[PDB]
Ligand binder design. Structure first.
Ligand SMILES: [Mn+2]
Ligand SMILES: [Mn+2]
Lengths: 295, 929, 295, 295, 75
DNA sequence: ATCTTCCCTATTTAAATTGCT
DNA sequence: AGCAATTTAAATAGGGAAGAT
């Protein structure tokens, strides 16, 4: 049976597109219409997203869920504007460790402890920024980013509600979106439905950080129905709360660099694997959410 | 961690390994996988790639070094992935391999000619005594010697002549004598009782002429005439042509046999004997079924007649020939490239970058690792092994628990069980309690590993679990007694498995000073045998004596001379790598080892002396050592304590000495809060193990975690009265020690148990050495012989430690490192060095280390006994009820701090103390009352 | 094939086997083994299951989740589910944990409702025994079995602590084991490591019970980290606590009958799922958890 | 017959050890003494080398030479201080460009012109340091290295005799070798017959720079038999000037880094390929002899 | 410039294509080569891999962008 | 349906030998 | 000594059928 790899120590992640996923001689493999059967390292896979035109058998889900691979679908509520229901199946056949649910819900029910936990996860945004630096984009130590991080921390320190929190999010994310855009010399309006690369790479990285965040949640047993951020535009649950720790530190710089340096979708996807395994972001989120629940 | 796995496999063994290797890595096409994975993912991929079956052809590359190579895949010598490999690469004057083939084939067709007598036939049928008067190997030797005296034994028709009883069958012909010794010693070696012969015989034939029938073969001798009347039903087709082709092979190659040296002949005939028992036991293990009757060799489990002697001789021949071929033409399976070794050592491990001063392409290496304790010696040994490439080594260590400690270090740093194999051959019942899931410790016996190709030539596919772990291990972290049998055994085929293990693997012997003198002699015999096949010996001992380091170098030099002249290469010398925590030095040494070794020793001494003195020892003046222990405990508590709480170690010599010191200290009236522990070796399985785990967790002073295992709130004297079980293999840190003197290496080791983990220098004195050992009041003639190198041949003129030791002295390894032969009768250190050079000398003697001529005999395994102890019977406690004359007693309950109870287990009592009741007790184990 | 499971009152847990689920003419259908297509009505089903031999496609997944038909992947039989997402209040309009889930959490938190719910789960376990009467098994109305039932009822009602309830639960469970051993003429002692027919048949029947209890806990959104009897460190202890209700009432007589007649494992699986389909055992567990959590 | 690949953009680079070099089925390969046949890409090889126990054949040498691969033999050093004699087969069947040899001759025969070329080539190693800066080891622009190269440039500017050039050559080599020794905290003495890894990595880099220098000289048709720097100690030919232009810039820090990190020789071979390929050191040397020849 | 050639051909068209591309890159193994070569030398390799004959099976990967794919490549 | 095992099915690689230069 | 032609044969891939869930 063995240790079967810790899910923080899995490095492969995939989002398959226009394929039939099946089992051929015990192999998780996706077959395209040209007759090409590409295997998947299912005992090392973090997640397999499924794009439009995809299909998967029962046995492929059976030996992905036995190996702890989270499988989601990018359509349905996957237009990312409402972000209501990205259809995301988890392996709950494995009986998960429970204590992170216990400390998480002790702080959830208590609304003051939920507010404090929300502030910690909002500070994790700037913690992610400082820890994960990029050498092909925005320097974190320049005056604009340091000023807006200081403004974000002094606003989230004196915050009173989740409506006040929703607003601080508006500021951080929107202005980091913008600050990158002005440094990448591009008039940019975030739109999930936009065709430019600066948005299609951003939605691909949104799905990638969705998979990383959901795998980090499921690892600890944490679900999604217990989010820390409640708002009108924050539909989607806890997976987006964990995922937007690493938009502006990881997903957004990689997407902006990709679009500016003319990468293709495949290489942006790979740049995402390289950053998610070189700095070990899954173990980062898993250990940090242990810091979040703790007691 | 980024790896790349390539497959060379045919069959659908390029298919059912593809499922597992495609479960863990992405497919880059053309049967090549490449991707990122964790180290535990590498371990899981190894475990389910090897277990999937035989024929897996997998090479893994981490960056550009090869991670692992499944099978005997040639893979990479310089580049990786060859083209087609067909046949006929080199084809040299192999000579000595043809010599070994001819000797093994000629002897193996003659090894069981002596079962044809009528006594062996009625022994197999079962109407006489199953023990023969003369063993059948000697009868076959008599047959071959009579045939050689009559006809020309190399080129003639065979025909077995009328043979009589011969006391000796060894003549002068060197090659015939080799065949005769292979025939006679295919079950056991001859043993020579003669003192003049043991005194003088050195050469090959000149010792072999003294091997008579009375050395074990001649059991009782009343049916000798029936034991030498013989039938000649072996004259068949295939037996005669096999005998003719092997005899002519020997005939054609024996011209290079006379150009060999004594050392060569001994090592080559040892290899021939090992291959001959390998083939004999391999054919005797399996059941062949068919038989041509009228003559028989072996019996089955039902006792029926099987394995007729013609096809038995033919089967033993081909199996021994195949044994020889696979043991002489093996590219053995090595360990994984551990990625947590190859980076830089930081801080106190920064000396481990000395491997970047050693050549990575040397065929031989003799490491003398003189680094101090706590610096990571075994990790540095693994680093030195991995500097030359992939690792294949046998970490032979004293004690079970030290092998457990090195295994736990290997596990938590980088080594999985696909490369490591921890072998302790007793199946101890010491289990870990509290939490099985939250343990993260207790290295166990599974060895997913990889079965080597040498298992097919061993009897009945090696064995079960233990010998598979022995032979097939890339890294074999073992107790040392699974390796010292390579040099040879009395009775049976127990030599072959450690012999074939040490043939293709390096040898790493750590802290060889804790072994006995005969134990060190047979360990240097093992070093010589390991160097005989080009493997590298790593010795790791800080307190090395020049004598020891020298005789181990000379054993390695004789072995490398064997290996150099065996492959017809000119001997350039031995790559000696002196190593400590202050530096390294690699020199090609063929001569003048002594001046270079003493210069490195002096450099290490000067690198130890300008550091602050950590162990200041005062020899007490108080004659009576009981009250000397009292006064020294009071003084070193009043001087050395951590806020009123002090830890003391009373190192004494023997068990009744320990209980005497304990029973005095328990009845000792003082204002000090003495809390007494007994820490000797005579204890029941449960009780002993419990003491160990407690002591290891309370004397750990690298952190302040111990404050919670003892009552440090109240000023208390925590005193541990112990025998030499504390000075070997214990990671203990006492505030101070009171030492009963037995030997100077005991003084240095118990200095190493004081301030082992801290770095604070003592102010006045942290060691109080007793004036006399307690055997002075029992035997004033000799008192230091128990746990010391004093003896009947080496007597101190005075037993006063003011006369034989410095009154104030900084105790370190310097006195043991220097080496003094003069004034050995009135100083302990020069007494130690004297014995070490007078027993481990550069002679062959009979119990010595250069042993030549006697390897042919059973003498180095009888008169030099590994772990030579007393009779030792074992009184066993079964569920609270003792077996023999034990009688449980009650301890003094005055100052006992901790007392663990025991119900199962066993105590090891010498036969001398079996006469009286050992009187087992819960606090202190065995005594005389 | 096509299989209907009533779960709460009106929604039906559809189980689909040996079929390919896709979108035909704008609505979700599936081609079966016999080459005949079957559609699915969106109104009458909420849970739809994919058994062995089953593949689903991406737009079928999206349109099923947009119609409130939330999909799960299961081993063939319908009660061995390994992959799903979490029930919300609505699948598209919002993301909130279900009322049942929140009620369970609150009940678990305050110590008195946790003790009362532990007593109640054992009350309904005794109810289950009587409710699901078998034919081959022992009589529940027999004097010895009724004495064991009243002993358990007295012991649960008079207890004020959980370890007393654990001792009483073990006494009741192994007393029913002893009663069924007295029926089937054997020395039966419950150990997981034994290779006899009764112990290993009870073990794999218990695994089936864990699967159906996992489906029942998932179908109301109850998470797998809030056990009543078992400890907080027991991984998936709520699955074991809910499966305890039907372990000694359904799994134990079926397993002892299966070891008595000595048939193979797959036909024991079909007997277990036949008993689950015939008497609506999952619906019994769903109503059991509603009555536990609603209080 | 096409452009036959120009020499400055040839990339592959080997020194073959303990293998007989042959041709199988079209391609040049080397066969070791275990049956392993590794192919040599002769169309892109710059040089091959032959260590102890090596043996090349006739048509293999022909396919290297007609393609234009310079081949040498590593052994031959028999003195105590000097890399004595390396035997080197020039591909002269390819008829070379001529006027670069005429320019080299017109500077070689004029003594004041040879001294002037000696001057610029001595500061060429100084600018090599400035251009080729490694990421490890020393920094070139520190005070000690700049002070010693400034003293070297000041002394070689006022130099008027070749023996003064040899003396200043000796102080330069002692200064660099010892400063690298200081950085890597070792005691260093340059002996070609030493077992220390800093020494035989330096001899391996001596062979590598020798091969690079004959390929650079043969690419412009320049013979080794016109040494513009000569002396009693310095008697190797023009290879011992165009080879040790790039010791203290390329090889010696790379040799010290390889002897500090301490894996096998193959990582040093591949690191020499990587740095001679990434910075185009061969084309850099060829272009430097180009701006030498026409000035 | 670091490229990688993958060959998926059949003997003896595999024999001859391995013969031809093994003159340009290091044999990383199992009919797959990887090595450093200039892009106009890559065009030279392309030109005499076309002229070498039919049924030939070569794909390229500069970084991972397919620099040239020869034949009806499966990929 | 999906997937597995096995039997054709022959298509597809590797070795082997041997004149020829 | 490399190679070529050319045989010889071992193995790889695929498709169809049938049996499992
Ligand atoms: Mn015998
Ligand atoms: Mn025999």
């Amino acid at each position: 049976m063995q240790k079967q790899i810790l899910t923080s120590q899995k490095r492969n992640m995939y989002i398959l597109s226009r394929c039939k996923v099946l089992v051929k001689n015990g192999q998780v493999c996706h077959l395209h219409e040209d007759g090409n059967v590409y295997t998947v390292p299912y005992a090392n896979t973090v997640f397999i997203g499924l794009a439009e035109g995809t299909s998967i058998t029962n046995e492929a889900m059976s030996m992905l869920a036995a190996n702890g691979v989270i499988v989601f679908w990018t359509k349905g509520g996957g237009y990312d504007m409402f972000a209501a229901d990205i259809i995301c199946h988890l392996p709950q056949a494995d009986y998960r460790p429970t204590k992170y649910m216990q400390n998480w819900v002790r702080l959830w029910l208590d609304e003051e402890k939920k507010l404090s936990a929300a502030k910690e996860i909002l500070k994790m945004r700037v913690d992610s920024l400082s820890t994960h630096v990029h050498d092909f984009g925005v320097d974190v130590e320049n005056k604009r980013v340091s000023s807006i991080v200081n403004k974000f921390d002094k606003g989230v320190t004196q915050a009173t509600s989740f409506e006040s929190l929703l607003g601080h999010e508006g500021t951080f994310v929107k202005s980091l979106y913008k600050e990158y855009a002005l440094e990448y010399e591009i008039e940019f309006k975030r739109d999930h439905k936009s065709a430019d690369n600066y948005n299609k790479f951003l939605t691909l990285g949104n799905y990638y950080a969705y998979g990383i965040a959901r795998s980090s949640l499921w690892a600890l047993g944490i679900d999604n129905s217990f989010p820390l951020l409640h708002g009108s535009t924050r539909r989607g649950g806890l997976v987006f709360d964990v995922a937007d720790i690493i938009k502006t530190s990881i997903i957004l710089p990689l997407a902006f660099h990709a679009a500016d340096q003319g990468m293709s979708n495949t290489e942006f996807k790979r740049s995402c694997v390289a950053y998610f395994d070189k700095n070990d972001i899954l173990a980062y989120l898993i250990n940090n959410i242990k810091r979040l629940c703790m007691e | 961690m980024f790896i790349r796995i390539k497959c060379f496999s045919k069959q659908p063994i390029a298919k059912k390994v593809s499922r597992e290797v495609s479960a863990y890595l992405e497919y880059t096409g053309n049967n090549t996988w490449e991707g990122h994975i964790s180290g535990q993912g590498v371990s899981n991929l190894q475990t389910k790639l090897i277990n999937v079956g035989k024929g897996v052809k997998v090479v893994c590359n981490y960056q550009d070094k090869v991670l692992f190579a499944i099978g005997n895949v040639a893979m990479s010598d310089t580049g990786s992935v060859p083209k087609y490999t067909t046949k006929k690469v080199y084809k040299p004057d192999d000579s000595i391999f043809t010599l070994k083939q001819g000797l093994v084939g000629v002897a193996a067709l003659w090894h069981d000619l002596g079962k044809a007598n009528s006594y062996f036939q009625r022994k197999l049928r079962g109407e006489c005594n199953p023990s023969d008067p003369v063993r059948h190997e000697w009868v076959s030797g008599v047959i071959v010697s009579t045939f050689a005296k009559g006809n020309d034994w190399l080129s003639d028709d065979f025909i077995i002549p009328e043979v009589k009883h011969s006391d000796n069958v060894f003549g002068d012909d060197q090659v015939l004598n080799a065949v005769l010794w292979l025939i006679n010693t295919h079950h056991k070696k001859g043993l020579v009782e003669d003192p003049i012969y043991r005194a003088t015989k050195t050469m090959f034939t000149e010792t072999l002429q003294c091997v008579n029938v009375n050395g074990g073969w001649f059991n009782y001798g009343d049916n000798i005439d029936e034991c030498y009347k013989i039938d000649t039903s072996f004259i068949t087709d295939t037996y005669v042509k096999q005998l003719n082709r092997y005899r002519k092979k020997l005939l054609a190659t024996k011209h290079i046999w006379f150009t060999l040296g004594e050392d060569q002949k001994i090592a080559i005939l040892q290899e021939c004997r090992v291959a001959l028992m390998l083939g004999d036991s391999n054919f005797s293990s399996d059941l062949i079924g068919g038989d041509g009757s009228h003559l028989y060799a072996n019996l089955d489990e039902c006792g029926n007649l099987k394995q007729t002697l013609t096809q038995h001789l033919l089967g033993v021949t081909d199996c021994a020939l195949k044994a020889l071929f696979t043991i002489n033409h093996h590219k053995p399976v090595k360990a994984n490239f551990i990625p947590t070794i190859a980076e830089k050592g930081e801080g106190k491990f920064a000396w481990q970058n000395g491997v970047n001063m050693v050549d990575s392409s040397i065929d031989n290496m003799f490491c003398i690792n003189m680094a101090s304790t706590g610096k990571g010696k075994t990790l540095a040994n693994l680093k030195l092994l991995q500097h030359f490439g992939n690792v294949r080594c046998s970490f032979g260590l004293g004690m079970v628990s030290l092998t457990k400690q090195t295994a736990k270090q290997f596990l938590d740093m980088g080594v999985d069980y696909n490369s490591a194999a921890m072998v302790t051959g007793f199946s101890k019942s010491r289990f870990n309690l509290g939490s099985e899931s939250l343990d993260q410790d207790e290295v166990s016996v599974e060895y997913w590993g990889q079965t080597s190709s040498l298992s097919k030539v061993f009897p009945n596919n090696n064995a079960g679990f233990k010998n598979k772990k022995l032979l097939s291990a890339p890294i074999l972290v073992t107790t040392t007694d699974h390796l010292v049998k390579a040099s040879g055994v009395k009775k049976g085929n127990k030599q072959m498995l450690p012999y074939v293990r040490c043939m293709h693997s390096d040898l790493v012997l750590d802290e060889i000073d804790d072994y006995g003198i005969e134990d060190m002699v047979v360990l240097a015999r093992l070093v010589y045998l390991t160097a005989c096949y080009g493997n590298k010996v790593i010795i790791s001992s800080a307190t090395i004596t020049p004598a020891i380091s020298n005789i181990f170098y000379e054993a390695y030099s004789s072995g490398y001379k064997v290996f150099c002249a065996n492959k017809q290469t000119t001997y350039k010398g031995v790559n000696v790598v002196w190593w400590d925590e202050f530096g390294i030095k690699v020199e090609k040494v063929t001569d003048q080892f002594s001046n270079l070794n003493t210069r490195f020793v002096n450099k290490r001494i000067t690198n130890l002396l300008e550091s602050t003195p950590k162990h200041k020892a005062l020899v007490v003046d108080q004659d009576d050592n009981m009250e000397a222990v009292k006064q020294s405990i009071t003084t070193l508590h009043n001087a050395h304590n951590s806020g009123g709480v002090s830890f003391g170690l009373i190192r004494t010599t023997t068990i009744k000495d320990c209980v005497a010191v304990t029973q005095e200290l328990q009845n000792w009236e003082t204002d000090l809060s003495i809390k007494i522990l007994c820490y000797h070796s005579r204890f029941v399985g449960d009780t002993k193990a419990q003491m160990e785990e407690y002591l290891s967790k309370v004397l750990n002073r690298k952190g302040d975690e111990y404050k919670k295992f003892v009552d440090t709130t109240t000023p208390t004297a925590y005193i541990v009265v112990a025998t030499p079980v504390v000075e070997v293999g214990r990671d203990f840190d006492f505030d101070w020690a009171i030492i009963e003197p037995s030997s100077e290496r005991s003084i240095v080791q118990c200095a190493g148990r004081v301030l082992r983990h801290r770095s604070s220098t003592p102010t006045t004195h942290n060691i109080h050495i007793l004036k006399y050992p307690f055997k002075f009041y029992r035997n004033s003639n000799i008192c230091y012989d128990v746990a010391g190198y004093e003896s009947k041949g080496y007597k101190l003129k005075s037993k006063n430690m003011l006369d034989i030791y410095k009154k104030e002295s900084i105790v370190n390894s310097v006195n043991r490192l220097q080496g003094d032969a003069a004034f050995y009768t009135k100083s302990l250190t020069a007494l130690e060095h004297k014995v070490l050079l007078d027993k481990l000398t550069t002679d062959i003697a009979d119990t010595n280390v250069f042993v030549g001529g006697w390897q042919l005999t059973a003498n180095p395994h009888e008169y030099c006994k590994w772990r030579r102890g007393t009779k030792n019977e074992d009184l066993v406690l079964t569920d609270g009820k003792w077996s023999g004359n034990v009688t449980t007693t009650k301890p003094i309950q005055s100052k006992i701090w901790r007392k663990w109870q025991g119900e199962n287990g066993s105590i090891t009592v010498p036969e001398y103390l079996l006469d009286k009741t050992i009187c087992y007790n819960d606090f202190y184990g065995g005594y005389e009352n």
